[model samples]
Target chain A: RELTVGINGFGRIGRLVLRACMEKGVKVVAVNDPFIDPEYMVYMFKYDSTHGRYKGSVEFRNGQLVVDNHEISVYQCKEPKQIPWRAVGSPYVVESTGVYLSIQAASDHISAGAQRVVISAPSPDAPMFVMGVNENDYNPGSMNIVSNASCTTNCLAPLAKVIHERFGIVEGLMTTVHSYTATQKTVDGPSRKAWRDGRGAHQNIIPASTGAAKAVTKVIPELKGKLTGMAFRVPTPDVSVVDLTCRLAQPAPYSAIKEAVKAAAKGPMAGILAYTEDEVVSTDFLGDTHSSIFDAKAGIALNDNFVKLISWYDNEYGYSHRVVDLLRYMFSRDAE
Target chain B: RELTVGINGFGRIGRLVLRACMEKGVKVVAVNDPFIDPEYMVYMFKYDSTHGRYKGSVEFRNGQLVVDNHEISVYQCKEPKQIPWRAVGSPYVVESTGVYLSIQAASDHISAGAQRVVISAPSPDAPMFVMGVNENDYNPGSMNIVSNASCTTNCLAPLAKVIHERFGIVEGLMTTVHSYTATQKTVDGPSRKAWRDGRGAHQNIIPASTGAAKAVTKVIPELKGKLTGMAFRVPTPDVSVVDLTCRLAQPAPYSAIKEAVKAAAKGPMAGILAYTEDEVVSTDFLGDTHSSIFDAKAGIALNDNFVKLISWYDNEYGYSHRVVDLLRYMFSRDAE
Candidate 1:
């Protein structure tokens, strides 16, 4: 009963997911990307080679796949709806292109013959699952598609979970100082679809749009009216800092709040909240294993009125890892 | 007797101080700068076409001097001690060169035959003078040298004055997200005589030495062991955001603390503390008339033990204005 996986989009996260799946012994049926060469994407993701050798071949040996001195192998598909996943014997599909997350878009992948389609980012009309919070709500038969949510939402979800379970959140505001993403044009280009977003990423502090607060509502329905989100694209390559302000229904002591997070990290939330006393910089969270690095430097318990917490996340890698985990969860439940 | 003021240095602060002094109808004796041409320095300062078109020089005119479009004389002296104020009949000197602030360094001006010198920045070795705080502390015979502290201190001083006077001294930590200054090199250049400052200003968050906490001790000596300071050079160019955390000795109500700041802003501290409910961005503080803009965006009071306050200032222009006010206080005392 070998599981075959089909990956869509050969971008950074998409390509990295293929590498992770191949390492986990899953057979990649096909990979689809619009502009990227499938072999070149594999080579770049497998090994950090500035020289650009190992043009187009994936080698696998001893339960390990290798490409450019690193073991990795996955099939490649060029088109999105034209990728033949069923003919190659793959039942599950992971959509990492970040282009098709809406219900209407995910339906196109299923119609193209993927039995289950898991989105790498949160879908506008679907539920976001962060393992322990709402993993049980996933239905393989009824809910054929799933969304992993954005990095900021993944970071905010656990924090919201802790506060909701303990202090009961009244309302909150969040500002994410996020690193540059693939969607941002490399050089100065025309604005994107949104207002003020088409400006050069390097030239201005462009105020754009964000949907993390809205996405949080899908997982935690009670928080629909209580959450608001804003984002700033810092001139950095990776990692993001989340500055969250929570106005609780009742005041919680700083020590009690810290202890709760620490306890969660030591317990069920071990892999989610990476608690640290170290002075962690933005670069320190690059390629981090946890969903978020909780910075408990100075937590304020403002006159028992509000609490401000700071957290860090490797927006691409750590967040994408959660997306893969959710995909695996959906696959295992289908077998049961 | 009319006072003839000599200005040293023609940089941002130096140039602004000259304009402020000239606007106040103070007689100009001479101006010195090793960098620019004396004629051009006078020309630009008198009529800064870049800023806007202006009239004649900053020269004295009518019973009330015309400030907007007046031409004034500027003399170039390469060396600080070589500026001949006596030759031009200027007795009072305002040192805006951002150098020669120590008591020993300022005495060299007196040796050059100037009657008095007022420093535009905080001098660790000399006493600091905040206009309303200790205006009477200006003594012509004994305390001819005075310092207007940095912008962070200016914003924090009024807050601390009211807090310390009301709550007594406890402990405080200040983190200033200061706008980048010309003093900080944009690209990596020759190493200064300081540690951790070798990185390029535009790329890295270079942690350099700051003298705010040390200067604050001079302003509020009672909280000597209680104050600490840290600074981060943000990507912006001018406005600075000040975050101060204070742990009060006695538990105070959040509303009471807010009221104290409001009262101080409307009372004797009106000019220094500009209170406003308007949401201000970093650029809003640019060319701000007030020393510190108290962001009425709600102060967070934690557990009745700590209070977090946010304030803004246009570091160069606002602080330079206070420097002029401090100089005015010094000159009036000499007249008596």
Candidate 2:
């Protein structure tokens, strides 16, 4: 069961997914970005602002991406159907265009020859699978498409699960202190959002709905109508924080809450939930692989019933790795 | 009586406070900074990263700073114990030089001739005064030294008052997603407590004790043991957020909590707390005077008891203005 894949966009997440796939030994055979120059794209693969220079050599040879010894073909096409996924021998296409979000649009990838699709961001109608929390729900052998949920949701779900299990969240609320994304303008520009969002991204703390809370219900089911959230896109590059405040069914003593998270970091949620004691700044998690790390020093309890805590996640590296895990799980022999 | 003043540190807050005192009709006579060149200091006043350019012309002539038509003397001194505050014809000196954190260091300004001293950051034993929350407690006519608290505390106190007044907080916890300060290293270097803090200021989110929550009890004693907090110094020049999770004594509904803050912003807390619906981002509040701007879009709750909200504040300009107000209050006609 070789996991050969095609990437629909060479944007930040798409390119990073390609890197993660390569790291995981997944064969990333082809990439399509109608508006990008192959030369510039190769350069991006060679250098990243956050991760620094790519380890292997990346060069453009005859409009194809050559990374060290691997040759990855490039396609210049706007529509998913225009790329020859079958020709490149890639059955799965990781669509990260942020342009299409519906099942119908994703179906276009199947028609284009990608047997099944995995989208980077949350979409209109796809079975969302957050690896550590609810990958058991993935019917990869039957489901033709699945979404790896958004980066914010990936950070939100694991903590929501831990708290829901240990504290029985009577209800919960959170705010994602997110870094600015490519979708935002560096300076003032045209925007459909509220008046302030239309101002320069560097100059505003834009507020908007986070699909995280709603997406959690799809994974946890029990949290439906039990949680709500918002986002503030501030001026920063990566590593976002989720300020979670949970009201428990019983008292959430500081020691108990701390032990639960620490245990999770070492046991049930080892890979996803990290317990950090070193007071970290956002940049410290630049290349962090964990889905989220609890700032243990920040954990506090009002009583046995109420608690406040902080979680940090690298929106790009942490998230893109999860996307690779989804691809890994999807192509496993047992998945069929 | 006109409130005349001098500055101890020509750093970020010090220069901005100079602007604020000028705006408030306070007669600021002289300034001192041993480490900075007078020419560079004048240029810094003329051009700021967060607030843009100074509106008035600025120049350094004969070791003096001239802004537009106003000429002021600048002094080079290594110690607050040395600057001749009284000989410079000033009764107040703003000691923002993060160097002096003790009452003795602050009193050195008194020995040098200033009637009162105002230190910007949190100090060991100064009477903490957050404008809207506990300004009335400032017996400035008697108490010669006052503290404006840290930027994070200034943002935290006002909200704690409104929330405690209505819902009765059982306890609370918060994370200050603060902008990088001058204390942080521009590149990787040696760190004292947190190893990652030594990372490039623009490169990581450094976490450490904000001391903001503990400082709050100084302004509002009831919250003494009821709160805890931490800080994440993200890579940004100015404007920061406080992600607050309040555990209420009684269940707090979304509408009720929202109404309490909105009403306070418009009525009682008008000058200090600003209520905004603009979908703001951090940069939008670069020069915002409000101690905290409650994002109406971000006010959320699960049921009646738990709540999560975000507040934006200009860590420099907004905070510096309060320090100026304290100077004005201390020298006011009513104070004597």
Candidate 3:
């Protein structure tokens, strides 16, 4: 059973998903987005500011995206129901457009003959799953609409899981020092939402709200209502860090915390959770596949009851890889 | 009552200090740096990547750097003892050259016919003073050598002052999501210190060490042995942020903590500390003069006993402004 994915948007996440799919040998059958012309999408797929240049050749030829030797169908459709998923025969669709959130809306893909759809962002109505934290919770029969959660949540859940299981989190607060994104303005302007959202992306340390901590509860139910978090968007283009401070149920020293993360990185959560004592910056994790890279030297305990942990992740590249991992898991379960 | 000052080191901090002095109408008599030629120094002073172009016309002619109507002498000397501070009629010298850290090393400026010397960075031997937090403690007669402290400490002290005065910090951990500095390489290489120090500046989020929390105790004595901290150097070029979390002795809600900061920003700490509710990012504070801009929206409390604070600062610009502020204060007391 070969895994196939059709991305619904050609933006940062969607474009990177295609790249990740190519790297993992997953066939991308089609891409649907009305934002840009097919030629421009082909150009964007070849060059990225954050991720650098595409390894293989990609071009728009004969009304299709010729990535390497495979011809990927391109569609200029605005609505989910408008895409020809049935004709294209891509059973799994990745919804990365960021517009459709409700199940009633995402179900349009399923109605168009797709078997399952994974929303690239946080969809409150969908069953949210972080790859390592709760992929086992995905039920092929019931969960037709699943959420890969946000990049911040994907980086946080693994660290939170390790802490919650080893020390038992009584309560915690998360602060993500994130990079500027496409949603922010290049210069100061007026935004309908918050005053900061319209401010220049490369200009300030804009404080914004994130539901990552709230979304973590969806994957790890034991930590429900026990966590809250916010974000400070910085000047960088990609890569973000989670500064997690939690009050543990048990008194664990700083050494104990680092050991636990190291153990998981080597054992159960080997691929998903990475542990490092080496000095690394945001640029070092540009195309990193791990959901979280635990900074062992950065971990500190104010006392036995309270501790701090720092982890880094490439928000777009790493999260998109997890999206593909979840897609593979779904197909594996379907094969069984 | 006109004041004159000389500068050492033509690096980022030194050049910004020159820019700040010009804006504030202070006369710079001479500048000393053996690294770059005088002609190139003039070019750098005119154009800056972080602070933008200098407003006035500047040129190097006949061994003097002319800015607007003033012609200041330029000395290409590596050793501080070689500079002719007395011949230049500069009683005050701003030591922005990061190499000379000891009190004995800094006293060379005093020995070379300068009355007072201010170190631009943290020096354990010198009496450390943060502008708004403890500038009045300067004893001009006895203490000829003074430290302006590091940029992170300048941002942290004022915020820590308001929090400690209001809620009383029992224990805390400080984390600065700082911008890359001149010390870091543009590409990966071997460093004598930490491995991350040599990594590419625009590529990664590197974790390093900071003595800011330890230095804070010198200005605010109550915080000694009560706090510890580290640094995460991000890819950004200019602005950085301080993400502070502390356990307070007194219980306070989120509103109360914000109210305390708002009060200080309005009343006592007006010039040194800024309070903003607007959504802004790192670039907005590029040339901002204030030591810290508190993000009221980003503050949160996990419980009544613990609270988190987010504040942004232009590391070079803001800290340089404080250097001039300290200089003015030193001159003001001398006028008495």
Candidate 4:
């Protein structure tokens, strides 16, 4: 009830997190995006291609945003420290800038007067959390920068925990079938940022480097140095799946693995994880809230020791909800 | 140059194979598709979506398709025996109907007067071949029904062979990030065939049951019982990638496995298998001849034992080329 948050990026994840926060009755007090024009930004907030048209109207009055009779101030600061977060009484800020992924870059949000910063992605040095996996471990008093983790990692963590706890993985291979991001070009462009990512988005299946395998260990240390992951960005605009193949130390049959995942989906992972017996596709998760849906129909216990899991997620929407929850969690503690 | 072929089921792969055969100067004597209008079929041949507008134009004249100035007869037949292949003096045929994925169904193509039917997908029981893997094992004298394997299988076969031969595979996991097919509806429609496949193609990531693992062992028998695979049909119209993870029997390092794969791509597998250090995306393989592009940048070896490799393919175009090569191999024997 007492959460006022600011957003540092106005891209896919940033704006979605803002929407999620607002949906949860949390006020997004301020926001910043140096790239898009205010008028166009307001237009975008009202109409998105993937999520369809927004619920309410939007207009720019006196260079400030007016939406659904609520006037929220917006800013255009490229530098992290240039933002005036404290002036808006924003103690918790969600930084969805893909550029500000590193620890220090995230700390810059805190240095800019945001009481604490919650990032929308995973970083090696930041305090990372997955709702179903490590939310209890969140130390708001000690933690200044909290990583909401990547879409892939958010799905990987709970699945990894289930397998690691039940069958005990010797090692694993993770491949994320990621949907194309806003960062990619619509057509072939210069390979400036990432050579492959710079290429036209629609024309190619791009191979991407991901730290998910190693980052999962940050949440599940028992998986230390035992997991390796890579990514391929498909032509889809949203929704991604993580194909996890692991070698089990315990080596149970498919039923055992299924029982564990199914139980988790129904109980401990109730709201955070979902398990589907029917064939559920990616589009089915477009506006989903669960971090991942364990595709039980596609789950396999190959041979005696090998296991495969197909986990689907709405990379943008589902991840945005997690970021929103982190805001709610952080703010709820202070309200008490 | 005296190869005369018949095409059964003029769908995505069938039309593509026809184009590839025509490009190779092979004569396609007869074609059949029960569902499409003869005039619309001619239009589709020239204005396809995934491969773009066909190289030339098409027109229906005198009950025959005139494409790019070549006059080819087209037939509409729901049942296999309804067509007369021998009447057209065609002994070789490409059956690309996703409908006939079983040996008996494929044999029906031969019952219709085709001496040898090269299928466009994997069947539980059929002599299968990949250009780079086990094509030499193909004996036209003994084999009447040939499966060129699915786009995923064609790519998986060579990679499985390379890794299995060099370091040996103790056990492995395969996942194909496949392109959406025609069977899928653009919006959620009735899912009579595959309930999962019936979901909105553009809206979801569909998990599909792949026969690639069991089919690969049909070529690379050594990998039999040691591998398992599942597929995710993302919203991409055509391009796909195969993510393979195997625990090496010999426990070789990353560099050794990379050497073998690069060597396989360059040496014995030349032209059919491409090895690239530069990052390549899916669209890069659009219209490519090679079955798979070894993503060397994504090649990873974990714990000195587990190894991962990513392979790229243009399912519609590249797999079509494979079908063309199968036609060439079977008919080339007649020339000898």
Top-lDDT candidate index = 3
Q: How far off is residue B253 in model 3, in Å?
A: 2.2
**Candidate 3: tens digits of C-alpha lDDT, residues A1-336:** 567788899989999999999999999999999878778888999998778899999888798888997999888988888889988875699999898877878999998778799999999689999988889988888889998999999999998999899999988888898988999988898888788788877656677888998789879999987888788787788989998877789889888888999999999888889999876677778889999999887777668887778999999989999999999998999765
Candidate 1 regions exceeding 4 Å error are: A19-27, A39-79, A185-188, A249-251, A298-304, B1-336
CA shift at A137, candidate 2, in angstroms?
Answer: 1.9
Model 3 spans > 4 angstroms off: A1-5, A22-30, A34-76, A88-90, A186-190, A300-305, A332-336, B1-4, B22-28, B35-43, B52-76, B88-90, B332-336
Number of backbone-clashing residue pairs for each candidate, in the order shown: 26, 21, 17, 12
- Judged by whole-model lDDT over C-alpha atoms, candidate 4 comes out at 0.81
DockQ-wise, the better of 2 and 3 is 2
Per-residue alpha-carbon lDDT of model 2 for A219-293, expressed as tens digits?
889888877787777767788988776678966787777788889889988878898776566777888888888
lDDT per residue as tens, model 4, B300-326: 767678878788887888788888888
TM-score of chain B of each: 0.88, 0.96, 0.98, 0.93
Writing each residue's lDDT as its tens digit, candidate 3 over B5-102 gives 99999988889998889989999998999988889988999998877789998998897899986998888888988889989885689998888889
Give the Å error, residue A273, model 4: 1.9
What TM-score does the A-chain of candidate 4 achieve?
Answer: 0.94
| Model 4 regions more than 4 Å off | A1-3, A32-43, A52-82, A101-105, A108-112, A331-336, B32-43, B52-79, B98-112, B139-142, B331-336
Q: What docking grade applies to model 2?
A: acceptable
lDDT of residue B283 for candidate 4: 70
TM-score for each candidate, following the candidate numbering: 0.65, 0.88, 0.90, 0.89
Candidate 4 to native Cα RMSD, angstroms: 3.4
